[PDB]
Amino acid sequence: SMSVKKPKRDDSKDLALCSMILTEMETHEDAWPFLLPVNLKLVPGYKKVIKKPMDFSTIREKLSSGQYPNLETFALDVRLVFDNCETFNEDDSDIGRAGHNMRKYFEKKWTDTFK
């Protein structure tokens, strides 16, 4: 509250560390469905169904241009990519499986880096 603060957690390396994580997601062999924005002209249903499209390239541009106020808003966009993928893709498809694998990969790096 006013003039009563928890001790200051060092957040000065967050930007660099989120960038490193994102590089590791970009270079994963199962990243290919997620590298670029889904083409809304060419994928029927996507525009209407997926209210907030997100992809790694869009996250990278947001990161690079100071559009994440803190590390939690970054994790929300990453998770949005996987949540979108589960909304649109059967679990038993290549892209569905890719999404589960990438979410697992991300959540471990996240926990090991920050928790």
From Swiss-Prot:
<protein>
    <recommendedName>
        <fullName>Bromodomain adjacent to zinc finger domain protein 2B</fullName>
    </recommendedName>
</protein>
<comment type="similarity">
    <text>Belongs to the WAL family.</text>
</comment>
<feature type="domain" description="Bromo">
    <location>
        <begin position="9"/>
        <end position="113"/>
    </location>
</feature>
<comment type="subunit">
    <text>Component of the BRF-1 ISWI chromatin remodeling complex, at least composed of SMARCA1 and BAZ2B, which regulates the spacing of histone octamers on the DNA template to facilitate access to DNA. Within the BRF-1 ISWI chromatin remodeling complex interacts with SMARCA1; the interaction is direct. Component of the BRF-5 ISWI chromatin remodeling complex, at least composed of SMARCA5/SNF2H and BAZ2B, which regulates the spacing of histone octamers on the DNA template to facilitate access to DNA.</text>
</comment>
<comment type="function">
    <text>Regulatory subunit of the ATP-dependent BRF-1 and BRF-5 ISWI chromatin remodeling complexes, which form ordered nucleosome arrays on chromatin and facilitate access to DNA during DNA-templated processes such as DNA replication, transcription, and repair. Both complexes regulate the spacing of nucleosomes along the chromatin and have the ability to slide mononucleosomes to the center of a DNA template. The BRF-1 ISWI chromatin remodeling complex has a lower ATP hydrolysis rate than the BRF-5 ISWI chromatin remodeling complex.</text>
</comment>
